[PDB]
Amino acid sequence: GTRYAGKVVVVTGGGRGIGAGIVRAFVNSGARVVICDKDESGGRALEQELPGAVFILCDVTQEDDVKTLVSETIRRFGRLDCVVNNAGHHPPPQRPEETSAQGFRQLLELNLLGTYTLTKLALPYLRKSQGNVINISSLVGAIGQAQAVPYVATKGAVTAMTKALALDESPYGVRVNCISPGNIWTPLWEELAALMPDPRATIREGMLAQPLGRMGQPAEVGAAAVFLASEANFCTGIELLVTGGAELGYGPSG
Amino acid sequence: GTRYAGKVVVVTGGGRGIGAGIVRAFVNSGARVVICDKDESGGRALEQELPGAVFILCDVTQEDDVKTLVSETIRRFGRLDCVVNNAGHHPPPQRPEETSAQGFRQLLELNLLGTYTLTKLALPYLRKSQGNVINISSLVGAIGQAQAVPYVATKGAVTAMTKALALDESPYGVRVNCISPGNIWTPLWEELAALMPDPRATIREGMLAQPLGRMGQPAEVGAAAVFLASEANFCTGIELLVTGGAELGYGPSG
Amino acid sequence: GTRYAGKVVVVTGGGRGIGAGIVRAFVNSGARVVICDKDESGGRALEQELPGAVFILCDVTQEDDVKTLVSETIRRFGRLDCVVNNAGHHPPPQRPEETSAQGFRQLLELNLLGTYTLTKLALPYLRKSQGNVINISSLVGAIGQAQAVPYVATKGAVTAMTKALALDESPYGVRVNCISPGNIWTPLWEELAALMPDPRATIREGMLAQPLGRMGQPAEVGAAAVFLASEANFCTGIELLVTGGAELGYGPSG
Amino acid sequence: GTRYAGKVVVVTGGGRGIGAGIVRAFVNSGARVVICDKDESGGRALEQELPGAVFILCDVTQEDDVKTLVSETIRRFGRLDCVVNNAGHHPPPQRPEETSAQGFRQLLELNLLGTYTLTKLALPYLRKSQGNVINISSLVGAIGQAQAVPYVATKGAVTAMTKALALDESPYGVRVNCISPGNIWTPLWEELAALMPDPRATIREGMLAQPLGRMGQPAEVGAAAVFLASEANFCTGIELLVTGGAELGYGPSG
Ligand SMILES: NC(=O)c1ccc[n+]([C@@H]2O[C@H](COP(=O)([O-])OP(=O)(O)OC[C@H]3O[C@@H](n4cnc5c(N)ncnc54)[C@H](O)[C@@H]3O)[C@@H](O)[C@H]2O)c1
Ligand SMILES: NC(=O)c1ccc[n+]([C@@H]2O[C@H](COP(=O)([O-])OP(=O)(O)OC[C@H]3O[C@@H](n4cnc5c(N)ncnc54)[C@H](O)[C@@H]3O)[C@@H](O)[C@H]2O)c1
Ligand SMILES: NC(=O)c1ccc[n+]([C@@H]2O[C@H](COP(=O)([O-])OP(=O)(O)OC[C@H]3O[C@@H](n4cnc5c(N)ncnc54)[C@H](O)[C@@H]3O)[C@@H](O)[C@H]2O)c1
Ligand SMILES: NC(=O)c1ccc[n+]([C@@H]2O[C@H](COP(=O)([O-])OP(=O)(O)OC[C@H]3O[C@@H](n4cnc5c(N)ncnc54)[C@H](O)[C@@H]3O)[C@@H](O)[C@H]2O)c1
Numbered sequence A, B, C, D: 001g002t003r004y005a006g007k008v009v010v011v012t013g014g015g016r017g018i019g020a021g022i023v024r025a026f027v028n029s030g031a032r033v034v035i036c037d038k039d040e041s042g043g044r045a046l047e048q049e050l051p052g053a054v055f056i057l058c059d060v061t062q063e064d065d066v067k068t069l070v071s072e073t074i075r076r077f078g079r080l081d082c083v084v085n086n087a088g089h090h091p092p093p094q095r096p097e098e099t100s101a102q103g104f105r106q107l108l109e110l111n112l113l114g115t116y117t118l119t120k121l122a123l124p125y126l127r128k129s130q131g132n133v134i135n136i137s138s139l140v141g142a143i144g145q146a147q148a149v150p151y152v153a154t155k156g157a158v159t160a161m162t163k164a165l166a167l168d169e170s171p172y173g174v175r176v177n178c179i180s181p182g183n184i185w186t187p188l189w190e191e192l193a194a195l196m197p198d199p200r201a202t203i204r205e206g207m208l209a210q211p212l213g214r215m216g217q218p219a220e221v222g223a224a225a226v227f228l229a230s231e232a233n234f235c236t237g238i239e240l241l242v243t244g245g246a247e248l249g250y251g252p253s254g
C-alpha cells in the first residue's frame, strides 16, 4: 500500500482488539507504526509479525511513559504524522448506585486524560508534519447506554474534546477527528459477555442490535482510521460512526 | 404560581447567574427551593429575598458537603422532587498547550463529578417522589469552542451522562434531562470578558453570535428548567438548547 | 391560565389526536385558538366544547383554503401570535419498492408544503406580533424508521426547514421551532395498528419502544408547544424531542 | 487503483463540480463509471478524457430517462455496484417571502425525488451485487442556512431518507449512506457568487466560514465517496461531513 507511505503513526492500546486492527490497517497502507500498550503479550507478537510495526511499552495514564513514547518515536523514526488514541476500557455493567466517584475518576484517567496527554505531547510534531489526531470514542457517548454512566460520560467527553481541539489546531493545519464504533467484536466484548448469566445470549443480542445483523470488525475501524488520516483532508472535528446502523430507528399512554 | 406547588427543588450554584434565575423560576412556580452554593454572599441574600427559598452552604466537590445538603433538605422539607446541577465554571480562554492534566482534573471535579455526586445521593429520594434531574450542560459540549478543551470536554461528559442516567432511571419513573445554554449574560460572562483586551468588543461579539442578536437571560434558562421539571413528563434524556440559535448556520479551495 | 393570555393561535389538524391536545393546552393557557382541519367531525365538537376555540374548515394542501384561514383569523380576532403546523399523515408501512413518486409527492404536499404555505401566509402577522411558529415534525425524521421512506423524508424536511426559517426570521423577532414527538397514542396510531396482523402486539411493541414504557399523550405534546410559544423566548430553530427516550441506547462479526 | 476494481458505479450530475470529482475518484479506484448528466458539455468531454468512464444523457427528474440509464448501464456493463446521487441545485439566495410553493416543488423534484427514483430503479441490481447507495446531501440540511428555505428542506429530506432506506435495505446487505459537504469550490459556487453585489467578498466569506480557512475540493468529496463504497462495510445510514469544520463553534441580554 502507498496511501500513507512514509508516514509515522502511533496507535495506543494497539496490542489487541480495535487497536491491533488499526495497526494492521496503517501498516497495510505503507505507514510505519508504533504500537503502544500497557501489556506486552499482544503488542510484542504484533511487532514480530508486522514489518514496519514496533512495540513500545507505555501506560497512557502515566505521563512519563507517554513522554518517553513520543521521544522514542521521534528518535527512532524522525517524524510523527498521526496519533490514534484507542486505549480505553469499558467496565462491566454497573447500576448508577453501584458506581463510585473514585472508579469514575480512574476511568476518566484512561479513556479521557490519556488521550489528552498523548495528544498534547504529540501536537508539536504533528504541527511540523501537518499531521492529524484520531480519537476512538463510542456511539454510546452520543446516544447513551444502560448500566454504564462512567463509560458513557468519558466517551461524551472524548467526542466533545475532539471538536474543541479541531477548532484550536485548524490554524496550524492539524486535523482532529474521532471514530465512534458501535458493537465491535474484540477481546473486551468477549470478556464482558463472559461475565453475564448467558454469555451466548448476550452475544446474540449484540449482533442483532445492528440493522446489518452482525458486529463490526477491528479491520473496519482500521479502514475508517486510514481514511481519516490519509484521504479526509477537508474533515476536521467529525465523528465517524462505525456502528452497522445501531443508532437508526426504534428498538397505552399511561 | 402552582405549576410546581408542594415540590422541593435543590439548585446547585444557585447564588448568582443562571442558578439564581433557576431558583427564582422555581419559587415563582410554587416550589420550595434549597439554594446550594460554595459562597455565602449571593445565596444568603437570595434566601432573605425569597420566601420559599433557603440557603445551604455546600461545595459540590466535597462529598460530605453534598451528603449534608441532601440530609438537611430531607430533614427540613420532608421530600425531594428535583435536583438542578448548575454549579460549574468556565476557565479563561486557554490554548491547548497552556492547559494541564491537573487543571483538567479539577474542572472535571466541579463540572462533572459534583453533578454525579449530588445526583447519586439524591436518587433514592427522587425515586420515592418520581422526581427528576436537570443538568446544566452547554452548547459548546455539542459543537465545540475555541481555547476551551477542558471545559468543552466536561460538558460533553455531562450531556452524555444525562442520557446514560435517563436510561438507568427510566424503570423507576425518574426522568433525567439537560439544558445546554449558549451565551447567557451572567457574572461569569462578565468576569471572562473583563480579562480580554477589549471587553466591550468581546461582549458585542457574544451578543451577535446569536441570530436573535442578544445574549440569553438566567430567567430564560429558569423557565426551561421549570418546564422540564413540571410539564415534560414524556421527556427524558433530552438536551434542551437555550442558545438563541447560535448553532444554526455558518459564521479558494487550496 | 394566563401564560398566553390575549394571544391568538392557529393549530392545523387540530380536530383530533396531537392537534386536539395542542388546542386544549393553548386554551388552558388563556389563548384564543383557531382549529383548522379538513374534516368537520372532531373540530366542530371541539369548538362547542371549548370557549375560546373556534373551528375553520381548511385543507392545508389548498392554498385558497389557507389564505381564507389566515384572513378569517385576523378578521375575527385582530392578531395572530402563533401557528402550530400539526396537520400531517403517516401512511401504512410500505417497503421502498412499494412506494411511488406520486404517493411521495402527495405526502410532501401535506406534511411539508402545507406547513410551508400557512407559515408563509402567517408571517406578515407574526412579524407584527413578534409571534412564533411551531412545526410538528417527528423523531423518525432524525433517526429513521423502517418501511416509511416518504414519511421520514417529509419530516427530515420539516425539521431542516424549521432551522432555515429560524435564521431568516430572527432579525424580525419571530422564533421558529419544532417538536419531534415519538410514539404518541392518537387515532392515527390506533388506525395504523389496526391494519397489522396482530394489532395488540403492535401496540405493545410501541409502548416498550420507549424507556418510559408507555406511549406519549397529546397533552404532553401540547405542553411542549405552550412552552415554546409562551416561555422559550431565547429558543429558535430547536428540535424539542417528546419521545419518552426512544432515541436513547440500543435495541459474530461476519 | 484496485480498491474498487471490477465494480460499476453510476454518478448523477457527474459532468462537472462535485459529481465530476466523484467520477474521477471512482475511475482512479479501478471502477467503471457511468456519468449521468442533463447537459452534454462536461460529461461528454469527461467520457473522452477517462478510460473507464462513459456518458449517458439523463435528466434525473424524468423517470423514463432514469429507467433507460439503469437499463443501459446493465446492458453495457453487466452489473451495478454503487449509485451516487449527486445531481442537485442550489437556487440563488431567496428570502422566505420571495419563494413559491411551485419553485419548492421543482427543487424537490430534482434534489429529492430524482435521488429517490434512481435509487428505486437501481435497488434490484444493488441487491444482486450487495452494492450501496451514496447520496450527496448538504451540511445545511443539518444546521440550516439563511435565504434558502427550499434548498435546506430538500437536503434535510435527503439525509433523513438515507437513514430510512438504510433500515429497509440492511436485511439485503445494501448499505445506504450520505455525504454532507460544506462549501465546496465548484461551478455552482462560482455562479452563485457572481450574482452577488461583491462576488469576491462572497468568496472570501465562504473560505473563512471553515476553520480550515479554505473551501473544499470535488476530489475530497470523491475520496469520501470511494471510502463509503469500497471500505466502509460496517457503515450504513451515516452522514459523512466534508465541511472543513464549518459546523464547529460559534460565528446585552435584551
Ligand atoms: N469493542 C467495542 O465494541 C467498542 C465499541 C466502541 C468503542 N470502543 C473503544 O475502542 C477502544 C478499544 O476497545 P477494544 O474493544 O479493542 O478493547 P480491548 O480491551 O480488546 O483492547 C484495549 C487495548 O488497550 C490496552 N490498554 C488498556 N489500558 C491501557 C493503558 N492505560 N495504556 C495503554 N494501553 C492500554 C489493552 O491492554 C488492550 O491491548 C476503547 O477506547 C473502547 O472504549 C470499543
Ligand atoms: N453563562 C453562560 O453563558 C453559560 C453558558 C452555557 C452554560 N453555562 C453553565 O451554566 C452554569 C452556571 O453558569 P453561570 O454563568 O451562571 O456562572 P456563575 O459563575 O455566574 O455562577 C456559578 C455559581 O456556582 C457557584 N459554584 C461554583 N463552584 C461551586 C461549587 N464547587 N459548589 C457550589 N457552588 C459552586 C458559584 O459560587 C456561583 O454562585 C455552569 O455550569 C456553566 O458551565 C453557562
Ligand atoms: N401519533 C404519533 O405517534 C406521531 C409521532 C410523531 C409525529 N406525529 C405527527 O403529529 C401530527 C399529528 O399526528 P396525529 O397522530 O395526531 O394524527 P391524526 O391522524 O390522529 O390527526 C391528524 C389531524 O390532521 C387532520 N388533517 C389531515 N390532513 C389535513 C389537511 N390536509 N388539512 C387539514 N387538516 C388535516 C386530520 O383530519 C386529523 O384531525 C402529524 O404531523 C404526525 O406526522 C405523530
Ligand atoms: N458546491 C457546494 O458547496 C455544495 C455543498 C453541499 C452540497 N452540494 C451538493 O452537491 C451536489 C453537486 O453540487 P455542485 O456544486 O457540484 O453543483 P454544479 O452545479 O457545479 O454541478 C451539478 C451537476 O448536476 C447536473 N444536473 C443538474 N440537474 C440535473 C438533472 N436534472 N439531471 C441530471 N444532472 C443534473 C448539472 O448539469 C451539473 O453537471 C448538489 O446535490 C449540491 O446540492 C454542493
Ligand SMILES: O=C(c1cccc(-c2cccc(O)c2F)n1)c1ccc(F)c(O)c1O
Binding pocket: A090, A091, A092, A093, A094, A137, A138, A139, A140, A145, A146, A147, A148, A181, A182, A183, A184, A188, A189, A192, A193
Ligand atoms: O464493550 C462494549 C460492550 C460489550 C459487551 C456488553 C456491553 C454492554 C451492553 C449493555 C449494557 C452495558 O453496560 C454494556 F457494557 N458493552 C461496548 C458496546 C458498545 C459500545 F458502543 C461500546 O463503546 C462498548 O465498549
Ligand SMILES: O=C(c1cccc(-c2cccc(O)c2F)n1)c1ccc(F)c(O)c1O
Binding pocket: B090, B091, B092, B093, B094, B137, B138, B139, B140, B145, B146, B147, B148, B181, B182, B183, B184, B188, B189, B192, B193
Ligand atoms: O462563559 C462563557 C464565556 C463567556 C465569555 C467568553 C467566552 C469564550 C469565548 C470564546 C472562547 C472561549 O474560550 C471563551 F471562554 N465564554 C460561555 C460561553 C458559551 C457557552 F456555551 C458556555 O458554556 C460558556 O460558559
Ligand SMILES: O=C(c1cccc(-c2cccc(O)c2F)n1)c1ccc(F)c(O)c1O
Binding pocket: C090, C091, C092, C093, C094, C137, C138, C139, C140, C145, C146, C147, C148, C181, C182, C183, C184, C188, C189, C192, C193
Ligand atoms: O404514526 C406512527 C406509527 C403508528 C403505528 C405504527 C407505526 C410504524 C411502526 C414501524 C414502522 C412503520 O413504518 C410504522 F409506520 N408508526 C408514528 C410512530 C412514530 C413516529 F415517530 C411517528 O412520526 C409516527 O407517525
Ligand SMILES: O=C(c1cccc(-c2cccc(O)c2F)n1)c1ccc(F)c(O)c1O
Binding pocket: D090, D091, D092, D093, D094, D137, D138, D139, D140, D145, D146, D147, D148, D181, D182, D183, D184, D188, D189, D192, D193
Ligand atoms: O452552493 C452553495 C452556495 C454557494 C454560494 C453562496 C451560497 C449561499 C450563502 C449564504 C446564503 C445562501 O442562501 C447561499 F446560497 N451557497 C452551498 C453552500 C453551502 C452548502 F452547504 C451547500 O449545500 C451549498 O449548495
Ligand SMILES: OC[C@H]1O[C@@H](O)[C@H](O)[C@@H](O)[C@@H]1O
Binding pocket: A016, A017, A018, A185, A186, A187, A190, A218
Ligand atoms: O476475541 C474476539 C475477536 O477479537 C478480535 O480483535 C480478533 O481480531 C478476533 O480474532 C477475535 O475473534
Ligand SMILES: OC[C@H]1O[C@@H](O)[C@H](O)[C@@H](O)[C@@H]1O
Binding pocket: B016, B017, B018, B185, B186, B187, B190, B218
Ligand atoms: O452580571 C451580568 C448579569 O448577571 C445576571 O445573572 C444578572 O441577573 C444581571 O443582573 C447581571 O446584569
Ligand SMILES: OC[C@H]1O[C@@H](O)[C@H](O)[C@@H](O)[C@@H]1O
Binding pocket: C016, C017, C018, C185, C186, C187, C190, C218
Ligand atoms: O385513539 C387513541 C387516543 O387518541 C387520543 O388523541 C385521545 O386523546 C384518546 O382519547 C384516545 O384514546
Ligand SMILES: OC[C@H]1O[C@@H](O)[C@H](O)[C@@H](O)[C@@H]1O
Binding pocket: D016, D017, D018, D185, D186, D187, D190, D218
Ligand atoms: O469553478 C470552480 C471550480 O470548479 C471545480 O469543480 C473545478 O474542479 C475547478 O477546476 C474550478 O476551479
Ligand code: NA
Binding pocket: A046, A047, A048, A049, A050, A051, A052, A053, A054
Ligand atoms: Na515489526
Ligand code: NA
Binding pocket: B046, B047, B048, B049, B050, B051, B052, B053, B054
Ligand atoms: Na427565604
Ligand code: NA
Binding pocket: C046, C047, C048, C049, C050, C051, C052, C053, C054
Ligand atoms: Na368555542
Ligand code: NA
Binding pocket: D046, D047, D048, D049, D050, D051, D052, D053, D054
Ligand atoms: Na471513456
